[PDB]
Amino acid sequence: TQPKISLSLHAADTTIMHRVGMTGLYMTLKRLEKQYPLSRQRGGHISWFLTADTIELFWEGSDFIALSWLINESFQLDDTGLIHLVGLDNDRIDLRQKIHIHEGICGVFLRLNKFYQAGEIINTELRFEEKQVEYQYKSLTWYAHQTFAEKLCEADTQQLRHDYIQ
DNA sequence: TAACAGTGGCCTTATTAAATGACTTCTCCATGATCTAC
């Protein structure tokens, strides 16, 4: 039918950050499609058609439900409280690099406590060359990326906004 | 008017090439929930 969200690298109004964002969405969608082969499994029957330089999203029912499902599945938190982006191959990456990525995101994007709720300071002692070194990182319980779906959709009609979002 | 215009041997031997301590101090935050006044 008609895609509800269409994104292209050839759009003339996009900057570098916009294109990097479409690339991240493309990687996340590839990983999700590997995780959820059937569109019925995905909330709202959300389905996508990915090309070399275009992203199109189709879904049924309320826009808020489908967007919330996609965003919640895209941005996750593991048991330890680290940022778990399903766009990246998290099983293949080790714990130290995951901690590095989480700390970088928390120090660059989530600079402000207004956009994350901090948990306890989790300490882990991983042995290295017959020596156990204690990594101490700030675990999280929520960050704005998880619940931006509310800002993407209208409060009452629960549909995609037709205006600009600040 | 001439024939010479120095023949030698050396051209530094030692020793030490830095010892200290300092390697910026402050401040200017951004953003949303809430208080509050109109």
Structure tokens given for A58: 């189709």
How does A106-124 read in b/e, with b if 16+ C-beta sit within 10 Å?
beeebeeeeebeeeeeeee
Judge contact between A166 and A108, C-beta under 8 A: no
Using DSSP's 3-state secondary structure scheme, residue A113 falls into helix
Chain B bases under 7 Å from protein CB? 30-32
Taking the C1' atom of every nucleotide in all shown strands and the CA of A111, the nearest one is B30
Task: Calculate helix-pair angle for A144-152, A63-74, nearest 10 degrees.
Answer: 170
Which residues are within 7 Å of strand B by their Cβ atom? A 112, 114
Residue A56 CA and nucleotide B6 C1' are separated, in Å, by 108
Q: How was this structure determined?
A: cryo-EM
- Resolution, given in Å to one decimal, reads 2.8
Cα within 13 Å of Cα(A108), Cβ side: 6
The whole-number Å distance from A111's CA to B31's C1' is 11
**Is the Cβ–Cβ distance between A85 and A32 less than 8 Å?**
no
Label the pairing between strands A75-77 and A54-58: unpaired
Nearest to A137 by CA among A92, A83, A87, A76: A83
Kindly state the tokens that stand for A101.
Answer: 């990525």
CA–C1' span, A38 to B18, in Å? 78
> Of A61, A3, A11, which Cα lies nearest the Cα of A29?
A3
